[PDB]
Symmetry: D2
Subunit: 292 residues, 4 copies
């Protein structure tokens, strides 16, 4: 499923930084009960940077096993080296995932032509649908609409998670791609705006703790009921912002612990524990959203 | 050497994308002959993002073997996960390398506290000297002077490669650290200015192809002969700029090939071959520098 | 009228830089015939910076006289000194203008509190409706949604011309103001997007040469017919961009001369004549729009 | 003097917002006593935006009268319309002022060609020396080094006040102009660095309240005693920064009042009185500097 509210799920960890199966099960059951459309496993929010390839694959497989066919799983498969991305993609072929979320290479700042070649090569070596992920604030590069239009001609490149927060991108990309290419926000604070302009859903951090309100917001938006959706959005807005008061996923993991959805808020270095001021800010945002 | 003209050497490849030993040897002999102070092996210009950890270690060790004690070798050891940076650093413990160049974590955008913990943990697992590397355009995070001061208190954190191009950083950092902490430019176009303000050298892209000129410019700078150093700088300014006409190290590899220093200008995706326009721009810059 | 397509009209000049009444008459008749909602007289596009107060008032009065009640006129009344803005506003009280367009102070960078006091004072001393104008790229300051919400409580502050191009502002402001407060784009390239998110019209540069298509686009948008509006927008998009290929109003004045709407494309220094390359670019954009 | 510590003096006011002669006299005597090199009258810190042209001329002429030949006076003569800048400059022809400080046009964002024509026309209508002033944060335009080179060819264009805070500009400009062209910092926090790179002084906000320290710092810099100059700089750094805690000249006027140098800290809207938090921040900075 590549529309509506899609959660970029946390990778819950025990105190040693290893994946907590019991906590993940609780999250997945929560998303199944709450109407989330799909689960992005080991995206940014899932700490892809700090899991090695084997651990990363283990988390995706554990998420599929636990989902048990009740909700679709999309795997994070991005890398900044094209061979690495291909390799990681092969590990998931015939796994049961419905598609992959593949980020623009980070740190090395490839050209637009390099991005085209990167993603083209990855798509060539799988039959899985691929969702491109643009987030320049993290990567140092910006996959522009022109290049997205070029890539959308590749049969299995089927959408984009656009995390610039620059809402002009929605219709710049839309006019260059076919009607069935999926435009998904990757920026919760501007996501409703993104859907109002023509976007098809959101790959959401906020969905980790407000799954039902997110799912209803995105449905109302898809039906054109923007004023109604905006009422929900306004109650979620402090959380959309304050989940970034310290680096993601530090706040959202604390929030999930505070609601009882995960056993511990542990992360891997260089992510560090939430500050006391951050706990206070995040808690106030949860209360504004009606969640505590 | 953590002073003077330090080359961030290219990782020359054959047409298959693997390290070319004969080319590496030719480069290293070139830097010995030219008066280069040290070699940074598998930094950004060396394609650290697209070598696996074994391949990266092989290049470092080959470069050390080839240097044959004639020129000190600093290993690139950065990673965006602390565990991984520690693993990489441990590969070089008791190897012959003189120190490590370790970039701020990329993509995951840690806090300053996270940066402090990351570099502190890496330093604690080696006796090797550590040179911090800040390059926010590539990483999405900025290691600010205050945190550099906190880190400079750790015994074996001994300097910084400052690649913001923001020359105010030189004295901001210098006032917070001891007199023996090394300040190195990571930005060739501003590096002469950086030394004029108090910096101690440059880790240079330009030195790959103008090694003698860079070493002469840095010596003049260290001696306080800025006007003579600027004449050299002016001849190299178009190269300093045009080596980024396409993404580093696409132009510098081509330049090395054109100068006969390497056998091929091959890179690994998502870096792609230089465009025709880019060849012409770089060739004009080489001609301005009197290298061609 | 404060909705739909509102033109920020050029101030046509003869070769000596003085206002050309015959050219202005032709423009005004064109806007009356073409369905433009209103005329903003001596806005940015009308070269407010380079007319003195008397000339500025003369152009507004000439525009009212020529409009002869057939189209509403809004006067540019902004200044960077609050006393100056008050003074200029008094010159128009009982003139026949329907309202004023008042820019945030430029150059002096007042605080948000300073902006509040500025605009509050101006509104106090007139009964004319006031439209706030935010354009940070010109002014060096940014009138934020919070302050817009404060000002919208003042009875005769009735809307805003929002020229950041940052589409998140639409609903940030909307949620803080009453339903009757007018949100107008001041950025033609993002205006349709701005209306799709809840904006009520556009104060347009493009309208100077594409008045009928602009008027129909903004009507379709107001009716919710965004796909239909977007077809028009796509034909206008090169013009929305290329009217800024050199500083506004250099390109639009040339375009108006090329269509025969004004006798000369003369501007006042520091605006200078269009370059040949700029003529070529603008002409291609006019042809894409179907206007030549 | 177009070297050393040049104060951008406040225009002290009474409670009605008009120039306070007794306060101006006290300031000017203070700068004579302190070793200030020159006074810039009705620059940015002098509130040029909110004085009318007659009021502006009155302050300049009063400041010249009060200086009584003891200290050279440079008049602020910028405008964003060329005709207006020429008019203002002509007011000071054969007056006793030593030169003019003329800012790039603000708000209307001319091209570089426009900037060249603007400053060229102004220079052609006076025999007075012209100091260009670039401050893009306030004006929305950036006078680049190439254009500064073109302008430096005009006989009476003799220097630049460079207020970008981008220290690369010092040597970019210096290589394009003759050895007698003056480079002055417009950014107090970077000004010591600016002189270290080759600049010849500073047009300073800080000198309004730390005149002796600024003059001593600049003399040390001119003599090549950078380390001694930096000790002074460090004591003044919090002031250099905190004089912008609220918009300039709100903090510096309050500081002048607190030091007993002026009778009142009144400004003209849209500048507003200093907040309580701001008073406390500025007072702490004055205490760090040992001025209180
Ligand atoms: N830490 C490295 C490797 C992660 C690989 C598994 N997800 C990076 O962010 O690219
Ligand atoms: N491509 C991954 C792993 C590189 C391994 C280090 N040489 C990254 O940039 O972190
Ligand atoms: N050129 C000055 C005065 C213009 C006054 C009449 N519109 C400015 O832009 O503020
Ligand atoms: N307030 C207008 C006019 C100022 C007159 C010059 N002292 C401007 O900033 O241009
Ligand atoms: K395929
Ligand atoms: K496709
Ligand atoms: K140390
Ligand atoms: K009123
Ligand atoms: K109102
Ligand atoms: K000159």
């Amino acid at each position: 499923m590549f529309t509506g509210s899609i959660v970029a799920i946390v990778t819950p960890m025990d105190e040693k930084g290893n994946v907590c199966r019991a906590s993940l099960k609780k999250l997945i059951d929560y998303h199944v009960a709450s109407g989330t459309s799909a689960i992005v496993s080991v995206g940014t929010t899932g700490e892809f940077a700090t899991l090695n390839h084997d651990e990363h694959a283990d988390v995706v497989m554990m998420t599929l096993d636990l989902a048990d066919g009740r909700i679709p799983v999309i795997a994070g498969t991005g890398a900044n080296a094209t061979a690495e991305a291909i390799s990681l993609t092969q590990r998931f072929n015939d796994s049961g995932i419905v598609g992959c979320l593949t980020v623009t290479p980070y740190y090395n700042r490839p050209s637009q032509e390099g991005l085209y070649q990167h993603f083209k090569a990855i798509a060539e070596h799988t039959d899985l649908p691929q969702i491109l992920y643009n987030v320049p604030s993290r990567t140092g590069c910006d996959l522009l609409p022109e290049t997205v239009g070029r890539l959308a001609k590749v049969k299995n490149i089927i959408g984009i998670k656009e995390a610039t927060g620059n809402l002009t991108r929605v219709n710049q990309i839309k006019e260059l791609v076919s009607d069935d290419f999926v435009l998904l926000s990757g920026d919760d604070a501007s996501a409703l705006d993104f859907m109002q302009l023509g976007g098809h859903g959101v790959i959401s951090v906020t969905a980790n703790v407000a799954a039902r309100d997110m799912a209803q917001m995105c449905k109302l938006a898809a039906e054109g009921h923007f004023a109604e959706a905006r009422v929900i959005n306004q109650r979620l807005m402090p959380l959309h912002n304050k989940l970034f008061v310290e680096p993601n996923p530090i706040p959202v993991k604390w929030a999930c612990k505070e609601l009882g959805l995960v056993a511990t808020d542990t992360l891997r270095l260089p992510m560090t524990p939430i500050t006391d001021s951050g706990r206070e800010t995040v808690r106030a945002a949860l209360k504004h959203a009606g969640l505590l």
